[PDB]
Amino acid sequence: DRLDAALRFQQEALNLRAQRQEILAANIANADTPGYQARDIDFASELKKVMVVDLLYRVPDQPSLDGNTVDMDRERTQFADNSLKYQMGLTVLGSQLKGMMNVLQG
Amino acid sequence: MSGVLEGSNVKPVEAMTDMIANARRFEMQMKVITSVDENEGRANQLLSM
């Protein structure tokens, strides 16, 4: 359907933002697990792949003794950024749907 | 030598200096712990969108 092609990009971006949000929250929740590696996804490459998931390990900053590589500050900033981008995607998708609607209303 | 008993070799000057140093080090580490805890408490609000 042509309607899907117009809204495909924003829907895929929104779904990818939700998945990465879940991954970041999993990183936050498992901060205290000894031996847990902080995982993340490269948003742009996966968005290419879906439009046309694989988890990448985060490069550790400080060496802990229990093997936990989760850094609070980095993932807190990433979490806030992902929340903001999810809201922006919701706004853009809603604007596109509302425009398609006011075209029809009459 | 017979008729003499050997006592301990605990130097009291070293013990007193060790106690003073240990007390000061403990207080420094407690201060560092408090600073780190307060910093994390302030930092854990960013997550609010």
Contact with chain A for residue B40, Cβ under 8 A: yes
Spatial separation of the C-alpha atoms in residues B33 and A13, rounded to whole Å: 42
Strands A39-40 and A56-57: antiparallel
Q: Considering CB atoms only, which of A76, A84, A87 is closest to B47?
A: A76
Q: How many CA atoms does the CB half-sphere of A94 hold within 13 Å?
A: 6
DSSP 8-state symbol, A105: -
Spatial separation of the C-alpha atoms in residues A93 and A98, rounded to whole Å: 9
On chain B, the residues whose CB falls within 8 A of the CB of A77 are 46
What is the DSSP secondary-structure string of A65-78?
A: SSS----HHHHHHH
Tokens of A76: 């807190």
DSSP 8-state symbol, A59: P
Spatial separation of the C-alpha atoms in residues A75 and B30, rounded to whole Å: 27
DSSP 8-state symbol, B3: T
Calculate helix-pair angle for B12-43, A72-104, nearest 10 degrees. Answer: 0
Helices (H), B1-49: 12-43
Tokens of A63: 């060496």
Hey, are the CB atoms on B49 and A77 less than 8 Å from each other?
no
Q: Considering CB atoms only, which of A80, A84, A87 is closest to B47?
A: A80
CB A58 within 8 A of CB A39: yes
H/E element, A15: helix A2-29
Rg, C-alpha atoms of chain B: 24
Q: Which amino acid is at A95?
A: S
Tokens of A40: 């993340």
On chain B, the residues whose CB falls within 8 A of the CB of A84 are 49
Tell me how far apart the terminal alpha carbons of chain A are, to the nearest angstrom.
24
Spatial separation of the C-alpha atoms in residues A75 and A78, rounded to whole Å: 5
